[PDB]
Structures are given as C-alpha cells and as structure tokens.
Amino acid sequence: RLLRIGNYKNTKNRIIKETKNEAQAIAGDRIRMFIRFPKFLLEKIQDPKQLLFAVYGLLLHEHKNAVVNFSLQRWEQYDKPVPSQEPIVVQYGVRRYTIQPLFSQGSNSPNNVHKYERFLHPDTVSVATCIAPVDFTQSPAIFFKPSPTDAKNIELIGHGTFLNADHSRILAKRAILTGHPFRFHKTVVTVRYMFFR
Amino acid sequence: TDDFRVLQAVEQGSRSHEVVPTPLIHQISGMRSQSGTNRAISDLAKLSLISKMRNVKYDGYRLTYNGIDYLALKTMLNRDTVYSVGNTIGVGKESDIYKVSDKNGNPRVMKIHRLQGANWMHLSRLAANKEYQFMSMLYSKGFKVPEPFDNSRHIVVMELIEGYPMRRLRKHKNIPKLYSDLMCFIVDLANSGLIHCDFNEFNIMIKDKLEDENDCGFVVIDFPQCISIQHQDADYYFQRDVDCIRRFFKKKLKYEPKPDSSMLDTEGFGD
RNA sequence: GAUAGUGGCCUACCAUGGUUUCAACGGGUAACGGGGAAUAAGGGUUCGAUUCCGGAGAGGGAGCCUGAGAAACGGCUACCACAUCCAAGGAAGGCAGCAGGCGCGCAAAUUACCCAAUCCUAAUUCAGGGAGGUAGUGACAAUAAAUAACGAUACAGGGCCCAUUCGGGUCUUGUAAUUGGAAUGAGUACAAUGUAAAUACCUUAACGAGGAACAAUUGGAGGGCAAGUCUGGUGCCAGCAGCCGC
RNA sequence: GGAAGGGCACCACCAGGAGUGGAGCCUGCGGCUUAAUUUGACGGGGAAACUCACCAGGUCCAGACACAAUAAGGAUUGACAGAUUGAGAGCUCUUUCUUGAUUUUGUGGGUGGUGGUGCAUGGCCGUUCUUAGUUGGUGGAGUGAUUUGUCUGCUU
RNA sequence: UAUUGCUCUUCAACGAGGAAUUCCUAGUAAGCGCAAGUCAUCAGCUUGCGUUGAUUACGUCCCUGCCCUUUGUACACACCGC
RNA sequence: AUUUGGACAAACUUGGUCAUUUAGAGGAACUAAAAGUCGUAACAAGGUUUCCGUAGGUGAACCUGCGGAAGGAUCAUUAAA
Question: How far is the CA of B138 from the C1' of C141 (A)?
Fold first, then answer.
C-alpha cells in the first residue's frame, strides 16, 4: 500500500515543471486565502503579530507514504548509541515526523540489496530506510530525540538529507554460525562446537 | 549468470591461439581487477580445471579434461537438460557412460567423450558431432534407435531405455518372425547402403512392453563398425551379420531357416 | 582666403602625379608610448594599467563664451542615452577626484584627523588646499629574528691516559613529564619621549613562565625526491588520481 | 615453429603361444543403502574377539597450584557383606568399621601441554637426477646481450 | 550372515565366447602341483621351488609411444572485417 | 526679442546591406552510471607480398584495369686468388 514512484529525480523535476506550469498567483502578491480548517483547532489560533504564523505550500502526493531513504551522519560529540528500532523525530522539509528507521549502509549494490545494522554505525554515514511520506525538494534533514530533561525538548542525534523515494532498497540480517577446528588431519578437519544436532 | 558467462568467455578465449598465457585470460574476460581473474584461475587450478605450463620466459595455461563440462552443463542449462550428475553404468573406450537426471526428474544418459591442449577436446568434439549426426541419420531414415537429446560440444546426453541384452534372453514365442525380422533388418541396412559388421548378441537390445498386445521394438548400437557397401570387404561383413544371427538362432533359439537367407548379390538389387 | 604663423589648411584654375615584395594599402590587438620589470655563462624570451616624462578623455558626439592660455566638464549650449524632484505649469544632472554604495567578477580598504611637514594659489608672512601628510583596514611583496639557556644528580654508555682490578680525574651523549638556582620579552602599565593632536616605535618605575598550554604550522614518507622491513581497519566508495604505477 | 631423420622396446608392431573381456564364482574399486556398511589410491588391508581406526548404547576418570569457608565430639578416604543391576560392569545408602584434611564446594592466573597446529634451528628410513655430456678457468673478438670452446668430415 | 574339514543327496547357467584388452623368445611360454609368509581355521593373496615341456621371430620403426637431435621460425604480439 | 545667407555639424527618418544579443517556433542529428528487443551476441571463421598514382564496380568487407617502387631471402653454375 505504498506509493511506488519509479525514478525520483526525473519525476521530481517533472512535477516541479508541472508546479511552475500551475503557479496561479506568483511571489510578490497579497492573498486572502481560505484554508480548510476545523473548528476545534481554533483554540490554538494565536495573536499573529505575537506568535509567528507561517503558511507553506505542498506538492503532489507528498502526503502519501513510500519507502523513503534519508542520509544520516552522527552529530559531533554525540557518543550515545541508538538502534534501528527507537522512535526518533526527523525534520525534513518542514515536517517533523516520528520515525523508526532501518539503519543501512549505502555502499552501492548492483541488485539494490543492503545490510541491516542493529545500531547506528559510529564512524560513517548511514541510510535511514523507512515507511514515510515523500519530499520533492531534497531538503536538509535533522534527526533528534524528544526529551523534557534537556533545556530544549530535543536531543540532537545528527543531521541528514532526504535522499530518495526508493522501495527497491531492501535489508538483510546476518547470523553467523561458528565452530572451532579442533584437530587437524590437515585436509579433513574435525570441527568442534558449531552445530549440536 | 555472470561467472558462467566469463567462463564461456575464456572458453571463447581458447579458439584464438595455442596454449593460452595468463594475460590473455586476464583480458579476454575483461573483468575489473587482479582479484576476479587470478582467484578464478586459482579455483580452476586447485580443482584441476587448468594447469600451468611455464616454457622459458613464458607463462601459459593448460586446460585439462576437467574444466570444460561445467560450460557444457551451462550449454545444457541453456537447452533445458540435466541438473544432477553421476551413476556409472559402462566405461567404454571412446566415451564414459553415466546415468543422470534433469530438473524434471527423468533419468538420462551422459556419454562424455575423451579421445592435450586442443586435440583431445576437439577430437572428442568431432566424435560427439559425428555420432549425433549418425543418430540423426538413423532416426531420419526411421531406424528404431534411442532418441538424441543433445550433443553438448563433446558430451552426448540422450535417453535411457529399459532393455537387457540378448545373451540373457532365453527365447521368445515368435521365433521365426524374429528371424525374419533380423534378416529383413539387415536387408534394410543394405537398402540404406550400410553394413553393421558387429551385429552381435551384445548389440541388439529389446524393449518389452507387454505379453498380450506384443507392441515392442529394438535398439541397435553399432556405431564405429558401420561400413558402406562400396568398400572392399562388405560381402563377408553382411554374411557375418546374417550368419551370426543364424548361428545364434541355431545355438540359443534352436531355429534353422526354412527360407534361404539373403546374400550380398541378393541385396545388390536393393538401394 | 583663413591663421598667431608657414602648409591643399581651404577655395578657384591648371597639370597627372604620389606609395608599393626594402611588404604599400587593408585586417587583428585581451596595443597609451618610454624611463623600466622578471629571468639567464653568453646571446636571448616575456611583461611595462601602475609612484617619473609625454599623450588622450571626463556618459557619447558636436559647437562655443571668457581669458595670455580651454574647443575646459567640480564652465555654458543643442542632440543622443540614462536618470532626479514636482502642487504637473515646470526645474535640476554628470564620482575615469577623496571617502562610500549598487552591479560585475578569482580579484581589490575608512563615508577618520590635519594643513605641523612638502609644495602650490591669492590682493598674500596670517586665508585656502581629500594636492599632500597622519592613523585605521592590510600575511601584495621586503628586512631583522622569540618559541628557551645553564647547572648538579643518578642510570646507561663511549672515549682519554693511569687499569695491577679497584678507582683517579677530563670530555660528550642519552634519558629520568628527577631536581636546582638563573636570564628575558610577548603581554599589562606610573611616567617621559614622540606627534598638529594622538596611536605605535626607541627608553623606563611596578607586575608578567617550568613554559603537564605564554602549546608552530604546512605539505609528505614506492620511484623521480629526503623520509616506514611499524601497527590496526579496509580489500561491498576499494590497485589508488600531476608521470610511471605495483 | 604442427620440418624431416635415427634409435629400440613384446608396458610397440609383425611370426605366433597363453589368454582376458563370453558362463558361473572368488577378490579389489566405484555406486546405492544404512544406524555403521570406518578410512586411503595393493595400502602386509587376509579374515567372528583383538587388530578397528565405524555405529546402538551403558559407563569410569578428569581440574594442577593459589585461594574464602569448612576440623579429629568429625571433612573425608578406604576393607567390606547385604538392598543391588539394567544386557553386563559400574553407582547410591544401612551396618562391621579404617577414618584423619588425601578434606568437600565454588572460584582466580594455568598446571596438562600424555590438546595441539604454525615460526625457526639441526637433521633423517623409500629414496633419486639410481647425474651416459655438460660445466666452469680464462682467452680473444663484440656498448650491452653474444661468438668460440660446444666443429666441415668420419666413427662408436 | 553358515571359519573350516567329512558323508549322502539337490545337478544351475555354460556347446570355445563381442566391441575391445594383457604378457611373451629356451627350459622361456604354457600346464602342473609343492614349500615358505600372511596362518587361531581356510586361498581364489603374495613369493620361491621343482616335474612335463610347445609354436614362432631373432626383423621393423609401419601402429603405439618414448626420447634424441637438425633447424624453416616467434607475425617479437601487424591489419582487419567483428 | 526677432530675422537672411553661410561654413561647422550633433542627430533623426527612410530603404538596402553585413555583424550580432536574443527570445520563441520548426526541424534534424549525438549520447548514455537508463531500461528492455532482434541481427551475424549464445556466429562461423576467413584474408593475409607490401605499397604509390589514376579509373571503375562495389559490398559487412573490398576486388579489377594501367604504370611505377622494394620500404622483398642470389643457391648453384664460368672465371679469379
């Protein structure tokens, strides 16, 4: 039930062309905009000269999920580990979504088959593979972890970039079965404690 | 696909020159680095699929009989053939006969030919192609004979047939029609223009379908003995075929011919 | 005729000349010319917008008043191109001067102080000068040269002669974030000098280091070409990249 | 260099002889099967036990020293006979009792290297090239590399 | 799943054997048994011994190969179509 | 103030020509860190004195006329010393 866009870059640029075709009122104008807005959210309508109230437009089907891939580099002097399973809030575009991302290594695969890591790799850049709705701008991304203990309600895990809307990028967990070659009739070797049945 | 394709490429890197050096197997493959080529050649040499000839100032690579048939298996992966290999029934002179099976699970027959550097391989290839074309000629004329599947450059894969030789066959009920069959079939051979001089007991193979309908056939495997009628000595070859049939039917089946058997001068008004 | 004045400078009337392979004429220039600059054993090669001399121009063309001197742009007039104010009638404009802004681009400073020097102008010793000088910014280049220096100990050596052995001294190393007493400016700063007034420099009271941080970096360690026979990871972004490459 | 020429051989051919592969069986290998048909390419590998290196099971005996506890009224180690005990042998506790720190339990660097594979050193049974044409010492001539020796002939 | 030996009985394929294969020139082949090691019991296992004792070469490199050499040479790596 | 005629001469318009900044629109061709298809990929091999000028037919290629060059491997055999 995911939105499967074939090639992100060309379709992205084409939809940007469609958007520039469909620019109904250009930058530099003043608009009386009527937005569909429910009754119960009027309780957070604040004094607009007292609270900042910005309005950002969206594009076609940035609301629909895909398997999207983010870049991620660890924040500096952030030695704390984080697994591929914790909820972590991601700022991309303008939207800050709680995501449980799969941490993968971005080394190029001909068949687009990648590893699954348990944790974040402590040294290099990983890829966050996750079911999340799409961006069309390749925006900067910033990853954090909401915490009221800190001054800000934010613990900065790192930053990154909305890389791709790629669903062929799939992951695999390795399990190693290990045994000790105890005694050497040098070619035909008895190996001890690998399997038990 | 890829490793088999590169092994096909170094198979095609054999029909260029004589005994192939190391950098030609580096470059005919056209692979990335020292890794794939050198570790592949070492996997060949440790499985005895290749050998090193170091003739002064000159490294070279000598392919033995081992590292060919995989490609034939790859050639037979293309042509829907065998998946599992090995059951020894018969180690012949110019071929080694094995019982194999496909992906479909039917058992078949794998005659590998071993008849080095080019000539062992290439003469096994000529033998397999010649026997495949002779099998094609026999099946095109309509001779009851095993049906060929393929001739994977030097390994012939064909069907298995439920038969046992005539040395362990005591008799049948219709002995004079069997004599008329084994006369008229050599008549049909002379009408083909050929004489199979080794028409012995071990040649003739009988499949046995039922005991009521009597709808059976025969299998004749005499390939390095068939001689055209134009040759110097075909007269007593034909007569040896006829008379071995007759002396077997006198000794085993205790049957003497009431009609006179065909001569070569009888069959000179044939084909 | 015109001019300050010869002169096709121009005008009337005559002739039919003048230049050219010793390259005329046309074309190009990311061409202001020179004194000079960089680099070499010699001969040469390449730059010179740029501090001195000469030329030319003040958005592009043209014309002119005044005056000894201007075809003058911090003088005028008209057109062309931009552009300012406006009560819509009109009225003003030239930073390739000193500062400064936009644009442009790899590429370039303060909307500071002063006429005290050096000179210049005027009716003139006195007034005036973004000429010029001073300071800021400034790793454009250039000069000089701090980041430590002595001891004693031990310990390990080495050498000098006496060694028959010990030990008798002379050195010189290495270490030991072992110890000792010294020296001094970077920096801060009374004062004084400095200067038009200052800032800075040269002096100098009083502070100012064991310097485990008053912490020297930039590029390298296959060969060219001085420097690894070292360890770990890599070996799915990796035999790799001035050249050769393993 | 896919030139040609000689040996010189019954693991080559001709003259043949005995034959094998044809029948049955002995025996070695492969394959299948298994719980194992142990394992090599004759292995002195002739064979119910052994040899046995493989399966179905049942078992002993592990482990040093250090070190915290535990003590001779008892930690325990052994001579036992009975309850045993499944197929056999062990094993546990009731006495007759030796008991005597050999303690017992759980650990810490490793005794044990009769746990071993790699680095060096020295070296060895079968050996085998059982060296039947080559080597180098120079000469000279050629920048190097090379010529000759190592040859026209004849002969073993 | 008989170690083996003895007695009687049961009496199978097998009517000189294919494609192909091995060894060999005088007491050698071939036939024969015996003895010794494998041996607790047996050989169809290996080795020596003796009895009887052929045919046919004493030639060849024609097949099989094995070498020994001679030197035409490296296209010293060339063009291509692909 | 206005005004005649001169030389100086900025500019303006009209055409026609090159030299361009463009924008658009029309077409054509080259490529793939792109992806699948058949043709000879997964197919056989083949030519091999080499060139130079000129002319022709050609086909995936290349051959044939005419004339030059060696940038091609002189043995023997007559005489000489």
Answer: 100
